[PDB]
């Protein structure tokens, strides 16, 4: 029952087509609670969860300022990178930054992280100790030395150890209405005959939280080692998630096949067959 708080930042330069766009999204586990977008009508930080809109006006003001200040830093960060890599001023470019903290099942701090990327490629990451950096290339090493002189590692370490964790417990408690209870998946098995000899069995898992789930097919109660036809887990669009696994079986002997579902909301793994 580990919990996390995460912030995803995206800065995209668009030469000729105006100022660089800035997006920031806030996550507690798999729930998005806060949003910033430079192209948005309201240039401020916006609530996305029921338990976040509880917060006062100053909260929204400081968090707007925070993202707005980050917007400036990444604006020049894009300008610096063009020079580092001798890139043309004409092309679009991307910087990404994901930071955050995790708490343990007891409540105590488990992990902190701060990773960055230029044009999809790794650039600089704070080490697991929260004291050292790892640069990906020679340009990122110049960035590294500058950040070590500026004590950025020490300044983020204080935030994760102090503020980040403290706010996470707060959101969890205020959000235990939705956050601290896992939604158990609705599982069904459907039958689709392709021909008179064979038939597709589909294992549906719908309306679950969190996103993590394992669907495993079994014949005669024996596991299927090799890849099965399945889809990458997708959002239902209401906070819950969806996934299905499909196998081709001979018609008539559908009883010999069972779907084995592993999910956090389930105390014991759930077994499903064609009803």
């Amino acid at each position: 029952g580990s919990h996390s708080m995460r912030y995803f930042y995206t800065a995209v330069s668009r030469p000729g087509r105006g100022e660089p766009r800035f997006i920031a999204v806030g996550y507690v586990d798999d729930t998005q609670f806060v949003r910033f977008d430079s192209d948005s009508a309201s240039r401020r930080m916006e609530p996305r969860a029921p338990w976040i809109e509880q917060e006062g006006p100053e909260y929204w003001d400081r968090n707007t300022r925070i993202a707005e200040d980050n917007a400036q830093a990444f604006r020049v960060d894009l300008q610096t990178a063009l020079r580092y890599y001798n890139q043309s001023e004409a092309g679009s470019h991307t910087i990404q930054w994901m930071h955050g903290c995790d708490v343990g099942p007891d409540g105590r701090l488990l992990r902190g992280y701060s990773q960055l990327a230029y044009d999809g490629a790794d650039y600089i990451a704070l080490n697991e100790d929260l004291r050292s950096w790892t640069a990906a290339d020679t340009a990122a090493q110049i960035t590294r030395r500058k950040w070590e002189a500026a004590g950025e590692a020490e300044r983020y370490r204080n935030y994760v150890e102090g503020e980040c964790v403290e706010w996470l417990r707060r959101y969890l408690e205020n959000g235990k209405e939705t956050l601290q209870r896992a939604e158990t998946p609705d599982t069904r098995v459907t039958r689709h005959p392709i021909s008179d000899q064979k038939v597709t069995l589909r294992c549906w898992a719908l309306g679950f939280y969190p996103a993590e789930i394992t669907l495993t097919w079994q014949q005669d109660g024996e596991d299927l080692t090799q890849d099965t036809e399945l889809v990458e887990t997708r959002p239902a669009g209401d906070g819950t998630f969806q996934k299905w696994a499909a196998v081709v079986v001979p018609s008539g002997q559908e009883q010999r096949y069972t779907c084995h579902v592993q999910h956090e909301g389930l105390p014991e793994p759930l077994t499903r067959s064609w009803e």
């Binding site: 995803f8 995206t10 679009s92 991307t94 044009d119 999809g120 589909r202 997708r234 669009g237 969806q242």
Partner: protein, 99 residues
């Protein structure tokens, strides 16, 4: 200069029943660079849909969910058109009930 082709899934929030108001989701993931055009089409017509807020996975590749209200039936033709630099042509993906 790192390019990842989009991964599309077109589906509904709830199991589709004919004439029963539902939510049409287009889940575009694993793409880079970030700028992308994603439209939802009813009989080739552009629908007004709300895009979710841009994010990415642990390989730095982006994901977006474009969704809107729709009434599922056999007559109408619902799809998700996606424009991207990696794409030679705009690829349109049809929605199917027994997904």
């Amino acid at each position: 200069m790192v390019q990842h082709a989009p991964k599309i899934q077109v589906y509904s929030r709830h199991p589709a029943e004919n004439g029963k108001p539902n939510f049409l989701n287009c889940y575009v993931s694993g793409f880079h660079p970030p700028e992308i055009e994603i439209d939802l089409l009813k009989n080739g017509e552009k629908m007004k849909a709300e895009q979710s807020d841009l994010s990415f996975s642990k390989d730095w590749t982006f994901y977006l969910l474009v969704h809107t209200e729709f009434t599922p039936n056999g007559q109408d033709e619902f799809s998700c058109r996606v424009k991207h630099v990696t794409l030679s042509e705009p690829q349109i993906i049809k929605w199917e009930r027994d997904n």
